[PDB]
Design a protein around this ligand. Structure first.
Ligand code: MN
Ligand code: MN
Lengths: 406, 424
């Protein structure tokens, strides 16, 4: 069943119906505005980092912003989360700057409104949400204000029609496609049953730089609970991959399909997973005809997160196998202290500063120790160990996790 | 209580009043010249009765109507007495619908003839039309109202302000020390000093006036040249002598008082001869309960200000579902044989009163539309009908639901058409 997935290529059907020349796009995904709102330390993280993304777009003078979904963490965001998102979009996206993008294709393009002066149009697809969910989303609200362009709507999970937004700047032509989040198993089934219809403009067939935006699992435990890369039509040149939190901004080239996949990652860690450790970035994609150049930009406002894997039997400072309750503590405490120094150094690197009295100090970092304690060693209560770093770490819970080798 | 309500009328001009140092196009968007025209309304309660199969879209249609009349009649601004939303946390549909109506009816190329003299973060534009990136044709001004929904520092009104669609004024950070500062607006020779007090728990506000903890600020320039307008959202009357705002408490320098919160349409206004102001209670644009006060046909108004004078034009709302109520005292009826098995007689009379109320409701609707009942014309929506029946004196009743079910597809409230009670 996993073997079958590699063999299946170009699924669904393709129908044909009706830097002045460099398209600059700020690419990001998953800001999860509102996540960890009630946390005393982490409460304002999502608001600050979502603002940063829009701030970089304005400072760097990009033509547009493209997001891979999950602007909000919840289906029903709090009044604070909604207010903060709207405030950031209004202050960073409105202005006298002319929009050099020409459209060739309340609901109509925002930067096309005569009553709204949009300097940098935001384009986003709908993402996945785990809180309890009518026919009105928080993304529909962002669209109605004229601040975000909601594209890639999936009204029916059965028959999905993928139509493009056609944009031109000088000689460079962009055919922007999107598929809003669909339950992975459902989407997988739609591609297998040939229920996904891609629409291409008849004119300038080979002229349009084809960009697809998705919000799905890139991998899964079950062979039907993710979207295989081979399923995606080979006429595409670039794929922006949302939903997946790990920053893989450098990208991966698929040699068969002939298209690059860029998984930018979230702008906030939503769990203490290994995937969340990779420093967060956004990117500037510079399209110029057929080729492009992607510039990775490190996020300055994201709280550092260091994870360390420890094997006790390998620690020459600890004696085995006795009551080393004291040995394990001293050693483990020093590893947290080492992880904090690594986190602080990672933060100053992102800022371009040095640790001195005149400079701003780093925020409390997220620290996780995965400790193998086999044959044998004395362990602590994980919560009791985590209480030791009360004003040194952002995570009051889960500083340590003890495990035995399987 | 009686002695305390009496003392309320004896007291006047509560608090403290001091002075503070301060077509035409005043909008900054970049891509009756002496008469300030204001569309006045209150309490649209967007989202109320959302889940009702018949009444679900009433609040959205009527809130749109108010903004639609403002645009059609070419007013300078919209002034609301609070409660744009029914809930503290409105649904996604309610918020979407309010924003859609505001964007379509208030944005446009129409020049704003109102000059902002002084507005006594902010990273955002406090005043709407002064934003160079938003083309505001008709600025909306509103105060915060009361909500019975659980309040889980950010309001839905703050969200409307942040989009640049509504100007939230008359904020009340502290209940103890309330400072009432004006928004100063000029059109030709006409000078408007606009004041607001967002809803405060009635008992708490009453105490603030008594403890002289309410400070009113007046512009030194043009002292007796401003037309003073106050916007409130409080109970105009109450059972307890401390649970409402007495008119006498409000400073007499005011010329006009827009009274929000109260749902009954009393758009004609009342003149207070001592305080020398006119109080206008416009009423809600939707019935929130089947109360006697909700029966009076709904209106909005156009307040025309020239110098220190005003003319108010009453406008009937066409989209509001008709509501007829009848109070029936069974002992005051005949021929109803009392203290006998009179179920048939009681029912026969009550059915005829519902039929009478339906005919009255339909006639009230056609009147609001300016049409006659003919095949080419639109038919009225299902009306709200309520019978409050006193059955004291020996009278047989019927289950309210079974009685209401006799009029299926004839009334909007198919569950509670009748209410049987005994006089206390
Ligand atoms: Mn996600
Ligand atoms: Mn009310």
């Amino acid at each position: 069943a996993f073997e079958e997935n590699r063999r299946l290529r170009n699924l669904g059907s393709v129908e044909y119906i009706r830097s002045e020349n460099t398209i600059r796009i700020l690419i990001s995904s998953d800001p999860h505005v509102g996540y960890g709102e009630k946390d005393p330390v982490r409460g304002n993280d999502s608001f600050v980092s979502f603002n940063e993304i829009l701030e970089i777009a304005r400072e760097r003078d990009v033509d547009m912003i493209l997001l891979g979904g999950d602007i909000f963490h919840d289906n029903k965001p709090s009044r604070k989360a909604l207010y903060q998102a709207l405030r950031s979009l209004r202050l960073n996206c409105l202005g006298d700057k002319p929009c050099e993008l020409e459209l060739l294709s309340v609901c109509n393009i925002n930067y096309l409104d005569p009553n709204i002066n949009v300097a940098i149009p935001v384009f986003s697809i709908h993402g996945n949400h785990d809180d309890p969910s009518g026919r009105y989303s928080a993304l529909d609200i962002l669209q109605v204000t004229g601040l975000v362009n909601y594209f890639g709507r999936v009204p029916e999970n059965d028959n999905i029609v993928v139509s493009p937004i056609l944009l031109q700047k000088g000689f460079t032509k962009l055919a922007l496609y999107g598929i809003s989040n669909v339950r992975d198993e459902r989407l997988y089934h739609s591609f297998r049953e040939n229920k996904v219809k891609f629409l291409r403009p008849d004119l300038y067939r080979d002229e349009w730089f084809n960009l697809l935006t998705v919000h799905q699992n890139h991998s899964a435990h079950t062979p039907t609970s993710y979207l295989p890369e081979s399923f995606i039509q080979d006429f595409y040149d670039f794929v922006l991959w949302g939903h997946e939190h790990e920053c893989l901004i450098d990208g991966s080239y698929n040699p068969t399909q002939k298209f690059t996949v860029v998984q930018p990652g979230s702008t906030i860690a939503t769990s203490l997973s290994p995937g969340e450790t990779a420093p967060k970035h956004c990117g500037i994609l510079n399209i110029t005809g057929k080729d492009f150049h992607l510039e990775k930009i490190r996020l300055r406002t994201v709280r550092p997160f260091i994870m360390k894997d420890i094997i006790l039997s390998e620690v020459s400072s600890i004696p085995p196998m006795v009551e080393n309750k004291k040995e394990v503590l001293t050693y483990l405490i020093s590893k947290v202290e080492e992880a904090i120094t690594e986190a602080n150094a990672q933060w100053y690197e992102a800022q371009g500063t040095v640790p001195v009295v005149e400079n701003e100090k780093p925020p409390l970092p997220l620290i996780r120790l995965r400790v193998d304690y086999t044959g044998g060693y004395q362990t602590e209560n994980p919560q009791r160990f985590s209480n030791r770093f009360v004003g040194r770490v952002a995570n009051a819970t889960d500083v340590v996790q003890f495990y035995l080798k399987k």
